[PDB]
Design a protein around this ligand. Structure first.
Ligand code: E4Z
Ligand code: MN
Ligand code: MN
Length: 179
């Protein structure tokens, strides 16, 4: 048992920890060994849920936090009913108001370089990209940040609090140096 596994369980709420475990077992990874990945999946889930909380009610379809098959099922219903092209890789949300999928990224590095890697990867110019960093930076496709800024600020504050919490336990260095 890691310091990291225990920290994750006292830092994140039980719903999120549970969903992260579901996700790792969907891909055959073990939360007890891949413990930095565990912390990151938890962090990304919380950010995604905080993000969907920022819109008006009914604004977002949440695709993250579902098992692989149901996630693609919801993407299919979105595509077959809005006419949007079906992405090749699973996004995180769908914006009913702007009518585009969103890929949310959380990075230990500089937002620029993770954004490039995502934009490279998806190869689908239709999926809007929004990166957050553990230093309070963000980067969104076409400089369009989707949410108004109080909702993005909460995410950035929470990310930095996780960073401090990890650091107070000397977990932070090992966490950064695993991307
Ligand atoms: O949806 C995601 C995903 C993202 O949306 C993302 O932004 C980064 C990374 N992702 N992935 C996450 C994930 C999410 C957040 C932080 C780290 C990881 S690391 C890979 C991994 C994921 C989930 C379970 C697992 F066992 C993994 F090894 C996989 C990529 O295949 C599509 C689904 N998924
Ligand atoms: Mn995802
Ligand atoms: Mn994501």
């Amino acid at each position: 048992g890691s310091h990291m596994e225990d920290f994750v369980r006292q830092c994140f709420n039980p719903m999120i920890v549970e969903l992260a475990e579901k996700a790792m077992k969907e891909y055959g990874e073990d939360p007890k060994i891949e413990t930095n990945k565990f912390a990151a999946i938890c962090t990304h889930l919380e950010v995604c849920f905080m993000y969907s909380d920022g819109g008006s009610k009914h604004r977002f379809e949440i695709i993250e936090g579902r098992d692989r098959i149901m996630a693609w099922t919801v993407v299919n219903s979105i595509c077959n009913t809005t006419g949007v092209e079906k992405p090749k890789f699973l996004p995180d949300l769908y914006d009913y108001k702007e009518n585009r999928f969103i890929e949310i990224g959380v990075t230990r590095r500089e937002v620029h370089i993770y954004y490039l890697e995502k934009a490279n990867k998806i190869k689908s110019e239709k999926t809007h990209i929004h990166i957050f960093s553990f230093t309070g930076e963000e980067m969104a496709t076409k400089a369009d940040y989707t949410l108004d800024e109080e909702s993005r600020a909460r995410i950035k504050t929470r990310l930095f609090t996780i960073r401090q919490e990890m650091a107070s336990r000397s977990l932070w260095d090992s966490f950064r140096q695993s991307e």
